[PDB]
Amino acid sequence: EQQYDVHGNVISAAVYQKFHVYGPEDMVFDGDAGGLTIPGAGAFWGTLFTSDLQRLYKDTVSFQYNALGTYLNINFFDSSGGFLGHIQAGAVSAVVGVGGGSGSWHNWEVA
Ligand SMILES: [Co+2]
Ligand SMILES: [Co+2]
């Protein structure tokens, strides 16, 4: 796995969360999750680990997050459940629990 610095944010409505991540090569993750968590908003910093960045960006369709431990973990998956990489980030207090949903990466040409 190669490592990359990333940062992001989350807005929770308790059952729904919107995630953004700003990744290397000027790419942006937009993700829409369900999950059992506290409402609120926060920012995070962390590390993206992936053995194939371009594949992560092309093939990600879904994500899952877990805040039950010491960090915020975000895993990214393809349409066949293949694991494409993950982020280890500092904890955000609006994200307890686990959850997940759809998302994808895009460049600056897409809002
Ligand atoms: Co967005
Ligand atoms: Co979407």
Author numbering: 87 to 197
Reproduce text from the manuscript describing this model.
Members of the virulence-associated protein (Vap) family from the pathogen Rhodococcus equi regulate virulence in an unknown manner. Rhodococcus equi is a Gram-positive facultative intracellular pathogen mainly of young foals, but also of other animal species and of human AIDS patients. VapB and VapA are normally associated with isolates from pigs and horses, respectively. The amino-acid sequence similarities between all Vap proteins according to ClustalW are typically in the 30–50% identity range, with the 78% identity score between VapA and VapB being particularly high.
Here, we present the crystal structure at 1.4 Å resolution of the 12 kDa C-terminal protease-resistant core of recombinantly produced VapB. Edman sequencing (Proteome Factory, Berlin) revealed that the resulting 12 kDa stable fragment started at amino acid Glu85. VapB crystallized in a condition containing 10 mM CoCl2 from a commercial screen. The anomalous signal originating from the S atom of the single methionine and two low-occupancy (∼25%) Co2+ ions was sufficient to solve the phase problem by SAD. Clear electron density is visible for residues Glu87–Val196 with some density for residues Gln86 and Ala197. VapB is an eight-stranded antiparallel β-barrel with a single helix. Unlike other eight- or ten-stranded β-barrels found in avidins, bacterial outer membrane proteins, fatty-acid-binding proteins and lysozyme inhibitors, Vaps do not have a next-neighbour arrangement but consist of two Greek-key motifs with strand order 41238567, suggesting an unusual or even unique topology. The connections between strands 1 and 2 and strands 7 and 8 (residues 99–101 and 181–184, respectively) display double conformations. It is conceivable that these turns/loops move to open a mainly hydrophobic binding site formed by the top of the VapB hydrophobic core. A function of VapB in binding some kind of ligand thus seems possible.
